[PDB]
Design a protein around this ligand. Structure first.
Ligand SMILES: CCCNC(=O)N1CCC[C@H](C(=O)Nc2ccc(Cl)c(F)c2)C1
Ligand SMILES: *[C@@H]1O[C@H](CO)[C@@H](O)[C@H](O)[C@H]1NC(C)=O
Ligand SMILES: *[C@@H]1O[C@H](CO)[C@@H](O)[C@H](O)[C@H]1NC(C)=O
Ligand SMILES: *[C@@H]1O[C@H](CO)[C@@H](O)[C@H](O)[C@H]1NC(C)=O
Ligand SMILES: *[C@@H]1O[C@H](CO)[C@@H](O)[C@H](O)[C@H]1NC(C)=O
Ligand SMILES: *[C@@H]1O[C@H](CO)[C@@H](O)[C@H](O)[C@H]1NC(C)=O
Ligand SMILES: *[C@@H]1O[C@H](CO)[C@@H](O)[C@H](O)[C@H]1NC(C)=O
Ligand SMILES: *[C@@H]1O[C@H](CO)[C@@H](O)[C@H](O)[C@H]1NC(C)=O
Ligand SMILES: *[C@@H]1O[C@H](CO)[C@@H](O)[C@H](O)[C@H]1NC(C)=O
Ligand SMILES: *[C@@H]1O[C@H](CO)[C@@H](O)[C@H](O)[C@H]1NC(C)=O
Ligand SMILES: *[C@@H]1O[C@H](CO)[C@@H](O)[C@H](O)[C@H]1NC(C)=O
Length: 339
């Protein structure tokens, strides 16, 4: 009387502090339950279970959770939706994401793949059962995945279908690389500092892996080929402020004096295209003084050029935009089943 694949409405849990005014804490205080006081992950002896991170309903559930979070929390000076414009108060908020656990209701469990080099689709030989996922931070980003978990063995390439150039590629790193972004005390001009030595080593490793998957062809990195600034720039939110950073220096191939510190030029933007697809939002100027965030680059989103089937190269560019891949990068090893 065991299990079968099934979709069901999950709930969430967290260590949200009831006394906090930080928006993730407020949201999870009234929309999640407390973290499981006694989590028990149970190994399944001699069991093989197949997974598919690209067809996982948990992704869509988390995505709508994060949309609701942002709709309740952020307050634009003016919002631009369709034919109208709605205008309100826009005070500065406290923004800092917290881990969110996802849990099944009665008669359901989460299966978890524990095979170290599991690429996201296919069988898994080391499977356990949990009641909740681990705490996942809902980090909204582009090009680079930040503050995520790490691949435990080798760098892993995740894709629905590597031969289709339209699908997104998720590179899951086995080594954090720090990105340290500050706006010092133009108020909107800022920058991000990255270790050149470490980054170029990791990028070399990503090229060796991509070569493994693409019949030993020459791997070339290129910047995005136009589009809105949210895709052409590494875009993220640091303590309420929307950073747009130029990553051209990260995706040149020459260091694939390139063992110093790379300094990426950034700008804090007040007017953004919402990742919700819902249009345009206008915020207030940034807080006075030093605005600083130190983050772990743990993943990379990549889109591969088409039309090079008859060439000796494959060229890749930082991608993103549809946030669901961000959640996929952390939900890949989980799946709901009905008991
Ligand atoms: C393949 C997916 C294509 N994507 C899109 O067409 N769009 C619409 C316009 C830009 C949108 C966006 O990423 N906005 C954004 C906002 C704040 C932060 Cl912090 C951030 F990281 C991102 C996403
Ligand atoms: C299976 O996963 C467990 C838990 O993550 C870990 O000890 C190891 O990777 C595997 N153990 C065995 C006995 O296969
Ligand atoms: C960054 O990565 C290190 C290990 O690579 C980890 O100990 C640290 O907690 C990470 N930072 C964040 C904010 O997750
Ligand atoms: C990370 O993965 C690469 C293979 O993708 C491997 O060569 C390297 O040794 C790994 N590093 C660590 C610290 O495990
Ligand atoms: C993951 O494994 C399956 C076969 O076991 C395959 O369909 C898929 O291409 C693999 N992923 C990668 C990145 O090779
Ligand atoms: C992958 O994509 C290519 C071209 O986009 C398509 O011809 C092929 O059938 C796809 N493979 C799978 C397994 O869906
Ligand atoms: C980040 O950079 C700023 C200035 O560039 C520096 O003051 C700060 O100590 C750095 N943080 C870390 C963790 O290295
Ligand atoms: C870069 O990382 C190396 C470790 O490989 C470290 O020794 C070095 O100090 C770092 N450089 C900078 C500028 O952070
Ligand atoms: C890639 O090259 C290595 C040696 O560099 C070779 O052993 C392997 O067969 C090649 N693989 C492909 C898919 O071309
Ligand atoms: C990023 O910087 C390069 C020069 O380093 C510049 O040519 C390019 O136009 C910049 N990207 C954008 C979107 O402005
Ligand atoms: C990543 O985590 C660190 C430590 O919790 C935090 O200071 C930083 O702002 C986070 N980065 C993002 C992009 O949220």
């Amino acid at each position: 009387p065991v299990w079968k694949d099934a979709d069901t409405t999950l709930f969430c849990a967290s260590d949200a502090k009831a006394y906090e005014t930080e928006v993730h804490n407020v949201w999870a205080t009234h929309a999640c339950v407390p973290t499981d006081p006694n989590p028990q992950e149970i190994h399944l002896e001699n069991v093989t279970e197949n997974f598919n991170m690209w067809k996982n309903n948990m992704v869509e559930q988390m995505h709508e959770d994060i949309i609701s979070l942002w709709d309740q929390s952020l307050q634009p000076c003016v919002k631009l939706t369709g034919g109208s414009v709605i205008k309100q108060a826009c005070p500065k908020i406290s923004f800092d994401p917290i881990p969110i656990h996802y849990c099944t209701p009665a008669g359901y469990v989460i299966l978890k793949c524990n095979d170290k080099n599991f690429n996201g689709t296919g069988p898994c030989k080391n499977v356990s059962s949990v009641q909740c996922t681990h705490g996942i931070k809902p980090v909204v980003s582009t090009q680079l995945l930040l503050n995520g978990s790490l691949a435990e063995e080798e760098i892993i390439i995740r894709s629905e279908n590597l031969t289709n150039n339209a699908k997104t590629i998720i590179v899951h790193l086995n080594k954090s690389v720090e990105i340290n972004c500050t706006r010092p005390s133009d108020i909107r001009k800022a920058y991000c500092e990255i270790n050149g030595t470490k980054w170029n080593k990791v990028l070399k490793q990503v090229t060796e892996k991509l070569k493994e998957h693409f019949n030993n062809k020459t791997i070339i990195f290129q910047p995005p080929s136009g589009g809105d600034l949210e895709i052409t720039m590494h875009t993220f939110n640091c303590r309420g402020e929307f950073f747009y950073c130029n990553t051209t220096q990260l995706f040149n191939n020459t260091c694939i004096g390139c063992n110093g510190t790379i300094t990426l030029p950034c700008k804090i933007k007040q007017i953004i295209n919402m990742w919700q697809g819902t249009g345009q939002a206008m915020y207030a100027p940034p807080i006075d003084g030093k605005i600083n965030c130190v983050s772990n680059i743990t993943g990379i989103l990549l889109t591969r050029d088409g039309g090079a089937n008859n060439t000796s190269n494959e060229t890749f560019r930082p991608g993103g935009g549809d946030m669901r891949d961000n959640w996929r990068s952390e939900l890949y090893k989980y799946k709901v089943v009905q008991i």
